[PDB]
Design a protein around this ligand. Structure first.
Ligand SMILES: NCCc1ccc(NC(=O)c2cc(Cl)cc(NC(=O)OCc3ccccc3)c2)cc1
Lengths: 39, 156
């Protein structure tokens, strides 16, 4: 029996920590909703 | 139960202790999460029950109490924020410039941020605070790291 608990408001935070890169990848999506890399 | 708009943890008592299996968004009385988090099962909110309303395994999305309400899209130019809700940890906004998933059926925004599997369903937002998609379905690239698609439904 799954249950939910509030974790916060959905708002943009000014001066939030900035990280992560922006890769461009060729991918395929199968009928089961799984993404895979196409090379 | 609690129906106030916001981000929520999805918990289960089936496994050891109380385990967080994912995250979701409550908006306009509808609860939005990823299919792999709940597998479409019913949810509890206090003494109330949330019943599934719509879902699709290929999109990896599910809505409860009503149809999918989130219809904002990434503009393809601007930075976004992942409002990450990791298991046992406080909600935290992380700003990033999305990458791209190029598919035979079009391009999708992607976020290269590494979080535990129980973070799936955390919302990705634009500068107006609108949810442009959910984090948690993507791929593992060469280094072993994670890149998630920005998964968004359709508002009928
Ligand atoms: N048919 C769809 C089923 C499905 C089922 C599940 C998922 N999602 C995940 O598994 C998931 C979600 C998030 Cl937010 C992060 C990760 N991270 C990830 O895989 O990182 C590599 C790694 C992990 C742990 C230790 C070492 C390396 C996974 C998607 C889809």
């Amino acid at each position: 029996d799954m249950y939910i608990e509030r974790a916060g408001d959905i708002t943009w935070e000014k001066d939030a920590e900035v990280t992560g890169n922006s890769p461009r990848l060729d991918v395929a999506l199968d009928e089961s909703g799984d993404f895979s890399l196409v090379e | 139960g609690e129906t106030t708009d916001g981000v929520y943890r999805v918990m289960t008592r089936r496994l050891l202790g109380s385990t967080q299996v994912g995250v979701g968004v409550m908006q306009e009385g509808v609860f939005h999460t990823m299919w792999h988090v709940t597998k479409g099962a019913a949810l509890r909110s206090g003494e109330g029950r949330l019943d599934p309303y719509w879902g699709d395994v290929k999109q990896d999305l599910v809505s409860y109490c009503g149809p999918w309400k989130l219809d904002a899209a990434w503009d393809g130019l601007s930075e976004v924020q992942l409002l990450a809700v990791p298991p046992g940890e406080r909600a935290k906004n992380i700003q990033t410039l999305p990458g791209i998933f190029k598919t035979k059926d079009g391009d999708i925004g992607a976020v290269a941020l590494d979080y535990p599997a129980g973070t799936s369903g955390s919302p990705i937002l634009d500068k107006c605070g609108r949810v442009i998609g959910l984090y948690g379905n993507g791929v593992v690239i060469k280094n072993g790291s994670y890149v998630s698609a920005i998964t968004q439904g359709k508002r009928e």
